[PDB]
Design a protein around this ligand. Structure first.
Ligand SMILES: *[C@@H]1O[C@H](CO)[C@@H](O)[C@H](O)[C@H]1NC(C)=O
Ligand SMILES: N[C@@]1(C(=O)O)CN[C@@H](C(=O)O)C1
Ligand SMILES: N[C@@]1(C(=O)O)CN[C@@H](C(=O)O)C1
Lengths: 459, 518
């Protein structure tokens, strides 16, 4: 049971899928490197920054209480109990920054509302959450799948892929996300071959089973994927053991993760995956790359991350091979900033700018946490929060790109996605940006390298 | 922070408004005597009984973990966190028996579902809870207000009280409960004069304010009340300071509590209040009356209850007057069993019979808690629970009165309500049962003692003058104007004044025309 406790004048809860969903009786598996450890640090970074900042919450140091969600909802839920219990050693939570998988953001939202705690997700995208009548204390800095589904169908409708198959992760994410695609699919005259869907505690046999059925309709060479990062790997893994080949069209769930195609660099070749529109946070880069087990002591998971990333081994381990070189480090050769890290940082600044207004509004005299705010008014903070608008943490170069954080009447973000193509040119697999989606598709077509190096056909 | 912990092979949570909602920064006010302390004890009693019982959960002693809800939702909610946390000193909760105010049963339900814990209320009545898509782990042994509102409207529709005023407690109980009456009200052609509603942290001024407004429509002498026990008292309190008088028609919220009219025995006289149909649990009577501070040590609130009920004082107190006689006791002169106590007991037995089945089903070999049930399957227990049917804890004499506990497809109970009349005959105020509601009203009318000892009247406009006038309707259906007619025209009907014509005249009563000579 590892957590992160940094005391402060005001505290923010944190939820990150630091560890993958553990198989069997256990709950937490291997370290999620890029979407777990990075995103986590990103929050620490953002806090660090908000504390070093003078024009945003100065007399109110921001403390954090971060918990791993081990990619499982029921688990994060239990963890989250930590925050509501913290309203009565206990940390007075102001807002929770969290919910990577939609699956857990919801399960968590269902509890924070009962205790009026503002939640902000930096990645959950299920349209289900937009419903501000069931998730009245939730907000996120990313747009719902209702706008990604469109982006997806409009990609097939452009390549006359009238007959394609769908397979979606079980769970509020994949489900709602596909039900979104299903609709947008019919409307553009696209018939769905076989409707596949994986699930929980699933092993190889259930994934191969899905591959089989994707093969029982060999007319549809284009398979649409609305699956979680994990279920999206197990699928490709299966599809590879039996040299099965298709034109993969996947939701951000797969996104541009090069860690999904690892071990099947080809069975996934010439695929098309979408991701959210984001511009890397310069400072975070230098920040993360500056980390190492000798200076990152506040992150209890760092060691395990270190040993796993470098194939290391140490005394604070079990019993393995190859000890680890001191001159080992995170550099530009072993690290690429995760796509959503931007959303993490904005999520936090939001919460902060939100509090920051409450500060100056409720307490004119000082810069410190007065008596007015000794005990926050959740409801208030949340309807003094949505109404937020600010220039993305200055960690952003431009300003003219609507790079300002704010929320809709639903508390969600702007639907800007990037279209990707999985290609390899020099013995190495990489993702190349080939168009995007603003409200209408776009892509330099003659940029795409397809499987069987030919523009596919699915009718 | 006081709780009750009795260890056991299986444990049941408990929520009771033992203390009234505290005013100011504090949270818990005075002890709720009859709906708090009694109902609490009734649960203990029921447990005590289920443990002394041989044919129902024998090898599985039932433990309880009871927490006061201080009548506040946000508070019970926090306390309830005690139970979900208890699924991981911590007590393995099987189900929570609780939720007096609807207000809190909901707020609570919202949390137990997140951890699959079966809840059962012995009194929350909000229709909102019937919705098994939002409260999938809730059940109760009382029927939704959807059936009480009907019973209420049907009581006014019988006394042609076409124009009456409504005032409802703020909070899921009063609100939803009135929205229920509002609808059933329109449907029976009943216009609502002024729609009043009290609230939170409300003091005298907001109650008087409500009285004032009830007075700004002095045509409606009948006021409908869908208010919590507490808000229902503050209102009458207010209504009394200013000798205001009406015919009070109140929901069970007020019910038949003689503790509501205390201090205004007359400003509330000749009122009509509804309650759930229930028959007192004989054994509980002997049981409760057998309690006293020297033998009730497991109930941490007992002393405070004792000191408060008897005006006592003790060393485990603050600093007051008049010490307390040892020979003080709860007898037939100072105690009347609360109306819902029955529901409390059934609520628990249900939970028990439920577990009891799970016991014999999951574990054929022994009578004890086996490995199959070491860790319960909420979802399962809940859909092995609703499907329950049993003869009310034998604490009931008859059997032929559908006195069997069970739940609807919604997890609610049977809508049977009793109609009451608040009357005083010998210097003492009491509640007299005067009819009930099965699915249709009923009441021996000539049983009711009204205020101004006269069957009241609540309509919009006065009746027309036969001698002349005709009924005229502008926009609504309760408010009309009386137009007199021309000495030469009769009335085809109540509303239409029709002219007789040439060489004729309308009869004296104005029902026809008598041919004139000359
Ligand atoms: C009003 O109530 C009286 C009860 O005495 C009844 O006789 C009368 O018919 C009612 N008015 C109508 C016609 O609705
Ligand atoms: N689209 C994701 C979700 O809403 O759950 C799937 N994976 C999440 C992530 O970025 O890690 C985002
Ligand atoms: N019907 C009540 C409720 O659910 O709120 C009103 N008063 C409660 C009580 O019995 O104390 C029950």
């Amino acid at each position: 049971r590892r957590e992160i406790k940094i005391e402060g004048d005001l505290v923010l809860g944190g939820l990150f899928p630091i560890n993958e969903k553990g198989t069997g009786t256990e709950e937490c598996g291997r370290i999620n490197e890029d979407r777990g450890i990075q995103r986590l640090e990103a929050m620490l970074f953002a806090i660090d920054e908000i504390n070093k900042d003078n024009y945003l919450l100065p007399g109110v140091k921001l403390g954090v209480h971060i918990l791993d969600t081990c990619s499982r909802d029921t688990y994060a839920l239990e963890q989250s109990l930590e925050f509501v219990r913290a309203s009565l050693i206990p940390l007075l939570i102001a807002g929770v920054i969290g919910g990577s998988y939609s699956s857990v953001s919801i399960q968590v939202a269902n509890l924070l509302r009962l205790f009026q705690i503002p939640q902000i997700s930096y990645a959950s995208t299920s349209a289900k959450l937009s419903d501000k009548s069931r998730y009245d204390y939730f907000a996120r800095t990313v747009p719902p799948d209702f706008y990604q589904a469109k982006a997806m169908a409009e990609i097939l409708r452009f390549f006359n892929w009238t007959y394609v198959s769908t397979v979606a992760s079980e769970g509020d994410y994949g489900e709602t996300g596909i039900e979104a695609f299903e609709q947008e699919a019919r409307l553009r005259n696209i018939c769905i071959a076989t409707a596949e869907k994986v699930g929980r505690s699933n092993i190889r046999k259930s994934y191969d089973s899905v591959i089989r059925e994707l093969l029982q309709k060999p007319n549809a060479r284009v398979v649409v994927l609305f699956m979680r990062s994990d279920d999206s790997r197990e699928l490709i893994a299966a599809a590879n053991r039996v040299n099965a080949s298709f034109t993969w069209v996947a939701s951000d769930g797969w996104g541009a993760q090069e860690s999904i195609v690892k071990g099947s660099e080809h069975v996934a070749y010439g695929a098309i995956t979408l991701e959210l529109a984001s511009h890397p946070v310069r400072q975070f880069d230098r920040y993360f790359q500056s980390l190492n087990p000798y200076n990152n002591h506040r992150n209890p998971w760092f060691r395990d991350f270190w040993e796993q990333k470098f194939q290391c081994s140490l005394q604070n381990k079990r019993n393995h091979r190859q000890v680890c070189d001191k001159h080992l480090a995170i550099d530009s050769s072993n690290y690429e900033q995760e796509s959503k890290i931007m959303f993490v940082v904005n999520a936090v600044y939001a919460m902060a700018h939100a509090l920051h207004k409450m500060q100056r509004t409720l307490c004119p005299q000082t810069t410190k946490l007065c008596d007015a705010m000794k005990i926050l008014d959740g409801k208030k903070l949340y309807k003094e929060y949505l109404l937020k608008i600010q220039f993305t943490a200055p960690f952003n170069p431009n300003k003219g790109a609507d790079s300002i954080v704010k929320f809709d009447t639903f508390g969600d973000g702007m639907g800007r996605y990037n279209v990707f193509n999985l290609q390899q040119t020099g013995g190495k697999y990489s993702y190349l940006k080939v168009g995007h989606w603003a409200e209408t598709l776009s892509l330099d077509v003659d940029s795409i390298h397809w499987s069987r190096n030919s523009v596919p056909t699915s009718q």
